[PDB]
């Protein structure tokens, strides 16, 4: 059934992409989302991957992000975006965790949500309120880099099944994935098999960064659907 | 059931109808002038071929250029597989009305009863006639995934009838699914006029090759073409 | 006084057969030449696993990729459990002869004493040699429930001798019977030769891994793999 795209295209440059609202500076549909604040999600022409115009996040310890409701009942979630970032993902000393796409249950917060991104230095998820992250410990700190100021093809599926999976595709590669209780480090998700259960009413998509690092992420090519989507 | 036949072309003849099946060439049922010296035309040939040496070419385009077998009666499920090799892609494509590669239909005689998979306005998908129902919905045309031209495609369509309360169509290709129907909202225009079991009377006949409704002529070669009523896999 | 065996494969070394375990690589058994330099091999891997960050990856077809254990003399009944990644489906598929991922054999140097678990004409089942039977009968075949391709799944085999007038076979995916023997006519040509008892010799290794009659290659990994004469669990 399902399906979202959006190639910016169709949005007036140097506004809030139309058709979504945000997470911007910690607040629900800021009504202060603009480039000439420090915080923003804005249509650019600065650069893009299709046509003239991306959208354009700068945020870091503060949230910029793009929102889109999802339709009551879905079974499963793919987010597709092409991501142009300032810095790398993965393989990173020091990280606490970052992240730039995910689904969410209530818009209001930030506190009931998976992130897709990294956690302590490899690509990864973190989920909350439980704070778990995956993968696992032994992982930490290694693995495959998302490069930075390069395009990325970034497919996140989310599937909800005894255990609900998530994997995440950079340009075609399986770079994470998430099918039983010990993928997560924390044992997961509070013991809940079904931990997408009650996440997909919003997807998002921006910057938000836990490591207190600031960035300016632009993407391009966004889709969501309840089917498959490829690069 | 335990229906499943082959057919990788490597016993035919070159420059003749592949042995065994029978054809709709220039919109007749077998078609008597068959041959590489008409304009439309299905052909073993042995200038490309996924499998072995041989395979069948279709040149067609607005006149279909197939290959046509009979099934067996009381199918519940169709599959049909081949390798396949487009000089022009099915999909994310401006201005198609719709284009077919392979299907089923009722009456080996014409086109007008039968299920179409190819591509319609311009994304990969499913055209039923008579009602001419198509799928997925306008909000999708135009866009989408690609079967690319000049590479081999391996392209896995799948037809549940049964005790499903709604019939189901999947095309995977090259092992991703591509294009699924499941509800009645999978049809723009409704809903094969508001019939749940829109493959009833359809599995007569399988057939392959070419045929354009947006006019555009193509040369496809198959090969490997598989029809089952159980799952085929690449 | 019972016997429960289990590997994690985390202290063996990548690229290496897993310490402990003997082969059938390659028709052969305990074959020197098992690593993945060779088309055919079973060796602990890092790239993929369901515990910790090992398990062991089989790469066959025809040619068996296997890793053998002893079982205890004296054996009533085994369990055998792994958590199982196939690159191809198990169950309801077209054209398939037989194909198995698990098993318990009389003796090492062959493939021609065993009982095989996996699928027999396309639906999950076993076959047992040298009789060549396979259950469950032909009614069933290319149907039934499925192993899907490409995720991690529980399989637990359960074959009960013993006191039995007739000898059993449970198998399990992800806590789903999905294959049942307990008479005569679950089999397709009525029970291993008139043997009501036709687990006996059996017990003297098991393997796991791949092997296909059917022409398919695949890769499977495994891990948590476990051996017992009590219930095992997922
Ligand atoms: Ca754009
Ligand atoms: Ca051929
Ligand atoms: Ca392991």
């Not at 809030?16 to 650019?44: E, L, T």
């Not at 796409?101 to 897709?116: K, L, P, Q």
């Not at 693995?143 to 005894?162: K, Q, R, Y």
């Not at 993928?183 to 009650?198: E, F, P, Q, S, T």
Request: include cysteine.
């Amino acid at each position: 059934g399902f399906f979202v795209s959006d190639d910016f295209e169709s949005s007036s440059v140097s506004q809030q992409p139309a058709g979504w609202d945000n997470f911007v500076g910690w607040q629900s549909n800021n009504p202060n989302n603009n480039s000439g604040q420090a915080v923003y999600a804005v249509v650019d022409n600065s650069r893009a991957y299709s046509g003239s115009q991306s959208v354009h996040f700068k945020g870091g310890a503060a949230p910029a992000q793009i929102v889109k409701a999802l339709p009551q009942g879905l079974d499963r979630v793919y987010l597709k975006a092409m991501v142009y970032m300032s810095k790398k993902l993965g393989n990173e000393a020091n990280d606490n965790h970052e992240h730039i796409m995910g689904v969410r249950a209530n818009a209001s917060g930030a506190d009931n949500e998976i992130r897709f991104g990294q956690i302590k230095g490899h690509i990864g998820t973190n989920e909350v309120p439980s704070d778990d992250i995956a993968p696992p410990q032994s992982q930490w700190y290694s693995g495959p880099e998302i490069t930075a100021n390069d395009w990325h093809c970034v497919v996140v599926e989310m599937l909800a099944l005894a255990y609900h999976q998530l994997n995440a595709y950079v340009d075609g590669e399986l770079l994470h994935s998430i099918d039983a209780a010990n993928d997560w480090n924390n044992g997961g998700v509070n013991g809940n098999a079904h931990w997408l259960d009650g996440k997909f009413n919003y997807a998002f998509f921006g910057w938000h960064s836990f490591s207190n690092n600031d960035a300016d992420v632009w993407m391009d090519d966004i889709e969501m659907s309840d089917a498959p989507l490829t690069c």
